[PDB]
Amino acid sequence: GTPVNLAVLKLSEQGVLDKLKNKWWYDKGECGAKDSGSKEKTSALSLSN
Amino acid sequence: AFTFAAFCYMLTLVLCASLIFFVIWHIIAFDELRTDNIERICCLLRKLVVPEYSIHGLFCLMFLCAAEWVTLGLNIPLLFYHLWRYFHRPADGSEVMYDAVSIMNADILNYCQKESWCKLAFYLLSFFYYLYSMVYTLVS
């Protein structure tokens, strides 16, 4: 308990665990992140109509 | 996916299929000149000149608005040619150009005969080039 409890405290301010929060999540926008280019939600008719 | 640029390819196929029909009277009336009347073919072919040039002036304006930097380049020497073939020639000043009724002067019949198979060359493969980039954008 307490070695791992003192680890996660140490792992916090070193910045390692939240680097691991990045490490497996930061690069995983390989889908394309199509939500990024869609925040207008425009409501005019387009050519498609 | 119908886009604005894809409409610019649909419109030019409507118009360049007439632009090949403008220059089919370029070669058939020259065939009437080589077989023979001159001021008849002068009065005819003088008329349809600013149509076959300023319709080409439309597309160079059009693909700029369509932001197609490829196809804007693939006709801009012809607009440079259409401008250059124009501005020296209306020195006669009757209506526009291309006949100057004493057309029977030498070396200008064959130089325009070079241009006869130059327009019929360029307009044809570009007609299948606009149909190429139509289908390229319309179902992408």
mmCIF file of C-alpha atoms in Angstrom, chain A residues 46-48, chain B residues 2-4:
data_model
loop_
_atom_site.group_PDB
_atom_site.id
_atom_site.type_symbol
_atom_site.label_atom_id
_atom_site.label_comp_id
_atom_site.label_asym_id
_atom_site.label_seq_id
_atom_site.Cartn_x
_atom_site.Cartn_y
_atom_site.Cartn_z
ATOM 1 C CA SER A 46 -25.956 24.405 -49.371
ATOM 2 C CA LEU A 47 -25.605 23.097 -52.903
ATOM 3 C CA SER A 48 -26.557 19.656 -51.588
ATOM 4 C CA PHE B 2 -21.678 18.824 -55.773
ATOM 5 C CA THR B 3 -19.407 21.806 -55.204
ATOM 6 C CA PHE B 4 -19.017 25.239 -56.743
#
